[PDB]
Design a protein around this ligand. Structure first.
Ligand SMILES: [Ca+2]
Ligand SMILES: [Ca+2]
Ligand SMILES: [Ca+2]
Ligand SMILES: [Ca+2]
Lengths: 98, 98
């Protein structure tokens, strides 16, 4: 009918952009992740990727290279990279993973 | 290294990780994208999401900054951020800062 099939990448990026949009809309500006907003993301999902969702605030200060406490899309985005890393980088390391 | 099944956002990273892998593996260098692996992604996939796949090598040199003429798994990643962002952004203002 209608709802034109986007490409695999387009789709996959839209999929994270929408999730971003919701988690960005929670508090101040559907445009930045605030810290509580961020903590909600790691608390709500991230079951097996980024364990120690407690020490988020460290990660936040790392993603937010400027430490302005607006994690803009591009700053927040960092997380998705690290996620995409952790898939294999369970360590790198010792007592790693096959 | 390797290998575990996951949740939703975890799927969205996996679904780009597979794409990454399928290109990364080409030459091989099953880690780093050469500019007949990289350029192939822009040529093949995009197709609408972003634009100026002609001056790919602009992006390449901007992405590549560790100077090893090989888009490593976390140079390459940058592009996914930009094309993600491009759903919003025009190339409004160019990304540069030290
Ligand atoms: Ca917000
Ligand atoms: Ca910021
Ligand atoms: Ca390669
Ligand atoms: Ca490089």
């Amino acid at each position: 009918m209608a709802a034109e099939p986007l490409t695999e990448l387009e789709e996959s990026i839209e999929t994270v952009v929408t999730t971003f949009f919701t988690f960005a809309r929670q508090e101040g500006r559907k445009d930045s992740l605030s810290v509580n907003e961020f903590k909600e993301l790691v608390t709500q999902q991230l079951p097996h990727l980024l364990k120690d969702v407690g020490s988020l605030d460290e990660k936040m200060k790392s993603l937010d290279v400027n430490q302005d406490s607006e994690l803009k899309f591009n700053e927040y985005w960092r997380l998705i990279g690290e996620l995409a890393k952790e898939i294999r980088k369970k360590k790198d390391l010792k007592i790693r993973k096959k």
